[PDB]
Amino acid sequence: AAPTATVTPSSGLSDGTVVKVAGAGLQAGTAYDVGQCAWVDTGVLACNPADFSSVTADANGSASTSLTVRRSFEGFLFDGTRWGTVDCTTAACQVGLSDAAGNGPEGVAISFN
Numbered sequence: 001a002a003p004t005a006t007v008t009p010s011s012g013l014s015d016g017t018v019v020k021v022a023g024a025g026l027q028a029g030t031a032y033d034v035g036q037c038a039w040v041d042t043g044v045l046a047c048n049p050a051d052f053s054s055v056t057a058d059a060n061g062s063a064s065t066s067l068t069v070r071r072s073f074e075g076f077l078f079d080g081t082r083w084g085t086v087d088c089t090t091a092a093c094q095v096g097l098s099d100a101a102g103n104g105p106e107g108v109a110i111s112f113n
């Protein structure tokens with residue numbers, strides 16, 4: 001079926017901005033982890049365990065959350081292993097939203113001003 005992932009990426013904003021994430025039409029009961037998961041290695045991405053707020057799907061099958069995009073964050077995988085400190089000063093960051101396994105909406109990139 002066609003889900004309804006409506007998120008608000010930080011385009012043209014500075015660091016410390018609150019990214020709005022609202023995913024509807026998901027699996028009610030599943031916990032979705034969302035963070036500023038950006039590129040950390042070749043084909044490898046990593047989320048931030050510092051300012052993260054995993055949201056569980058409600059009885060409507062929707063999950064709304066908000067994350068704070070930092071300039072530098074600790075990159076962590078979905079398994080629990082870290083990859084290193086990611087820094088988006090000269091590079092651009094992005095938002096990552098997926099379940100404990102790694103399924104969900106497509107990633108959206110963000111850019112500072």
Ligand SMILES: O=c1cc(-c2ccccc2)oc2ccccc12
Pocket residue numbers: 037038044045046047076077078095096097098106107108
């Ligand atoms: O920590 C990780 C975060 C993300 C990710 C999920 C959705 C959108 C962008 C990035 O993907 C991975 C893929 C493999 C291993 C770790 C990760």
